[PDB]
């Protein structure tokens, strides 16, 4: 309301974002966001994050390759000039470099079974699953994303001078400012939160092994001599929990030395 | 052993290191290292805890500091006994190493206004009254090495610096045959990595365990034992009578 | 609402309790202790 | 309501009308009228 209406309408004629985004970001009442949306003539599954779906479509006489994340709905679309397995391999290695994907869902197209695709998936260690996907929910998400991207591309084609620019603007508005129907958050935020909350077991196990690799020298309350190389479990501000021949001991920080004997 | 005897002799005539030092550095058996040492006519808690003291040697006052946990040594001869130079040495050693607590006596120089101001500015806790056996053993060892290298000493400051250098680097210590520098490096690195990993957890792992009382937080489960912390108290219980949620 | 007998018996019971407390006091005779104030590095004393 | 907030502000800076009056004469929702009244240092 502190001149937020003008900036909101500017970013809506430039972006055409959802009204929840206008309400949350610019701190304006929902009525203003709804009327801004109305004023625009162009507007009216929890699983493993390693699952992605890749598809190709023919729009405006050009071939578009779209990769979608199953767990969050994040999308990445590119315009491929000449349909060749080399460009499909390029897109696959790009998405592998930018994301730790582990499983890709594709149909039985000629370019999907190319030798370059097989080499890339074998080198990157990515599981390949051809054929119809087993989850109708993923297909429904694919259809919804396809229709939404078609609509936004039709809306934004007037601003851009090339199809690639329009596709990139569409993916930018979808990923960052657009808010999904569940929770009302951006797709990029959802996918980044899922990735952040996904890498927990590997780091937990590696930290456990590393903390067990440590060596501790401790003394008792009335014992002036130091003990042997007790394995380390947990370190605290003033107490340390260690193992010494299948015995759990809590030692004050004053009488404990922590070392990694390199030799 | 590959021409290592000649370099061992050329370094023993230089620093007169301990037998284990050149035994481990140049990869020689301990017997030949002991023989080289004998052949010389001149030879036969917490990371933040540091102890500082004053000594007198031939009309010269020397302020000497020592890390209690690793045995590292520093020293500086103060020309005129005053608290301002003690504060200067304290701030220099703070700038060169992280110190959280210093153990000194009730001396005027240690409690001087400049020293107190510097230690309060640096946020270093003060403890008066003092462990001492190790400090005295290090003091007499450094006196021995000072006497060893005094034959080539042009001035007192250079002799003290060379004695510190040979003590901290040119001599292997106790457990593991590691010098004071190696020990302090190891303890600092272990502290850093342990605190980093400790800050890594409690951001991902957050479980509530009920035993016998209250909603204690899980600390370590395994080997048929559950160690937990609650109300700033650590308790260890068997796997039975403990439910993890 | 209690007569003289209750008053005197309560007074004697209180006297017995205070005698027990004074015996607890006399359990400690010299027991020299040193103390500090506000976590100051200086140790202060002597104290009784 | 279409840019009527500015008109309400420029009328309130002179007459300092009530929220009901500024809502009725310019077709403003009651919440906007109330916050405009609140934002005035005199009302
Ligand atoms: Zn719009
Ligand atoms: Zn020698
Ligand atoms: Zn007013």
From Swiss-Prot, chain A:
Q: Where are the zinc fingers (Integrase-type)?
A: 3-44
Task: Provide the binding site for Mg(2+) 3.
Answer: 55, 107, 143
Give the top-rank taxon of the lineage listed in the UniProt record for this protein.
Viruses
What are the subcellular locations of this protein? Virion; Host nucleus; Host cytoplasm
Q: Where's DNA bound on this chain?
A: 214-261
Q: Where does Zn(2+) bind?
A: 12, 16, 40, 43
Report domain Integrase catalytic positions: 45-195
Tell me, what does this protein do in biology?
Catalyzes viral DNA integration into the host chromosome, by performing a series of DNA cutting and joining reactions. This enzyme activity takes place after virion entry into a cell and reverse transcription of the RNA genome in dsDNA. The first step in the integration process is 3' processing. This step requires a complex comprising the viral genome, matrix protein, Vpr and integrase. This complex is called the pre-integration complex (PIC). The integrase protein removes 2 nucleotides from each 3' end of the viral DNA, leaving recessed CA OH's at the 3' ends.
Q: How does it assemble?
A: Homotetramer; may further associate as a homohexadecamer. Part of the pre-integration complex (PIC) which is composed of viral genome, matrix protein, Vpr and integrase. Interacts with human SMARCB1/INI1 and human PSIP1/LEDGF isoform 1. Interacts with human KPNA3; this interaction might play a role in nuclear import of the pre-integration complex. Interacts with human NUP153; this interaction might play a role in nuclear import of the pre-integration complex.
| Note on domains (UniProt) | The core domain contains the D-x(n)-D-x(35)-E motif, named for the phylogenetically conserved glutamic acid and aspartic acid residues and the invariant 35 amino acid spacing between the second and third acidic residues. Each acidic residue of the D,D(35)E motif is independently essential for the 3'-processing and strand transfer activities of purified integrase protein.
Q: Under which name does UniProt file this protein? A: Integrase
Native organism is: Human immunodeficiency virus type 1 group M subtype B (isolate NY5) (HIV-1)
At the highest ranks, the source species' classification is: Viruses, Riboviria, Pararnavirae, Artverviricota, Revtraviricetes
Swiss-Prot record, chain B:
Residue positions binding Zn(2+): 12, 16, 40, 43
Query: Looking at the record's lineage, which domain of life comes first?
Result: Viruses
Where does this protein reside within or beyond the cell?
Virion; Host nucleus; Host cytoplasm
Show where the Integrase catalytic domain sits: 45-188
Positions annotated as zinc finger (Integrase-type):
3-44
Function of the protein: Catalyzes viral DNA integration into the host chromosome, by performing a series of DNA cutting and joining reactions. This enzyme activity takes place after virion entry into a cell and reverse transcription of the RNA genome in dsDNA. The first step in the integration process is 3' processing. This step requires a complex comprising the viral genome, matrix protein, Vpr and integrase. This complex is called the pre-integration complex (PIC). The integrase protein removes 2 nucleotides from each 3' end of the viral DNA, leaving recessed CA OH's at the 3' ends.
Indicate what this protein is called per its UniProt record.
Integrase
Location of this fragment in the whole protein: 1148 to 1415 of 1435
From Swiss-Prot, chain D:
From which domain of life does this come? Viruses
Q: What is known of its domains?
A: The core domain contains the D-x(n)-D-x(35)-E motif, named for the phylogenetically conserved glutamic acid and aspartic acid residues and the invariant 35 amino acid spacing between the second and third acidic residues. Each acidic residue of the D,D(35)E motif is independently essential for the 3'-processing and strand transfer activities of purified integrase protein.
Where's it found, cell-wise? Virion; Host nucleus; Host cytoplasm
Q: Which species expresses this protein natively?
A: Human immunodeficiency virus type 1 group M subtype B (isolate NY5)
Q: Which residues of the full protein are shown?
A: 1148 to 1190 of 1435
Subunit structure of this chain's protein:
Homotetramer; may further associate as a homohexadecamer. Part of the pre-integration complex (PIC) which is composed of viral genome, matrix protein, Vpr and integrase. Interacts with human SMARCB1/INI1 and human PSIP1/LEDGF isoform 1. Interacts with human KPNA3; this interaction might play a role in nuclear import of the pre-integration complex. Interacts with human NUP153; this interaction might play a role in nuclear import of the pre-integration complex.
Q: What is this protein called?
A: Integrase
What does the protein in this record do? Catalyzes viral DNA integration into the host chromosome, by performing a series of DNA cutting and joining reactions. This enzyme activity takes place after virion entry into a cell and reverse transcription of the RNA genome in dsDNA. The first step in the integration process is 3' processing. This step requires a complex comprising the viral genome, matrix protein, Vpr and integrase. This complex is called the pre-integration complex (PIC). The integrase protein removes 2 nucleotides from each 3' end of the viral DNA, leaving recessed CA OH's at the 3' ends.
Instruction: Enumerate the residues binding Zn(2+).
Output: 12, 16, 40, 43
Recall the taxonomic lineage recorded for the source organism.
Viruses, Riboviria, Pararnavirae, Artverviricota, Revtraviricetes
State where the Integrase-type zinc fingers lie: 3-43
């Amino acid at each position: 309301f502190l001149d937020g209406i003008d900036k909101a309408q500017e970013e809506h004629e430039k972006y055409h974002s959802n009204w929840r985004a206008m309400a949350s970001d610019f701190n304006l009442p929902p009525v203003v966001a709804k009327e801004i949306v109305a004023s625009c003539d162009k507007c009216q599954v929890d699983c493993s994050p390693g699952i992605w779906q890749l598809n190709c479509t023919h729009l405006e006489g050009k071939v578009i390759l779209v990769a979608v994340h199953v767990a969050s709905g994040y999308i990445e679309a590119e315009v491929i000039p000449a349909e060749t397995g080399q460009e499909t391999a390029y897109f696959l290695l790009k998405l592998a470099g930018r994301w730790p994907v582990k499983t890709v869902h594709t149909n039985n197209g000629s370019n999907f079974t190319s030798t370059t695709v097989k080499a890339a998936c074998w080198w990157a260690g990515i599981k390949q699953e051809f054929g119809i996907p087993y989850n109708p929910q993923s297909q429904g998400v694919i259809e919804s994303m396809n229709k939404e991207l078609k609509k936004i591309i039709g809306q934004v084609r007037d601003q851009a001078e090339h199809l690639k620019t329009a596709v990139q603007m569409a993916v930018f508005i979808h990923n960052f400012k657009r808010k999904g129907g569940i929770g009302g958050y951006s797709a990029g935020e959802r996918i980044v939160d899922i990735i952040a909350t996904d890498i927990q077991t590997k780091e937990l196990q590696k930290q456990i092994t590393k903390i067990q690799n440590f060596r501790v020298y401790y003394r008792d309350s009335r014992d002036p001599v130091w003990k042997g190389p007790a394995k380390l479990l947990w370190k605290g501000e003033g107490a340390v929990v260690i193992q010494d021949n299948s015995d759990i001991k809590v030692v004050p920080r004053r009488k404990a030395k922590i070392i990694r004997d390199y030799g």
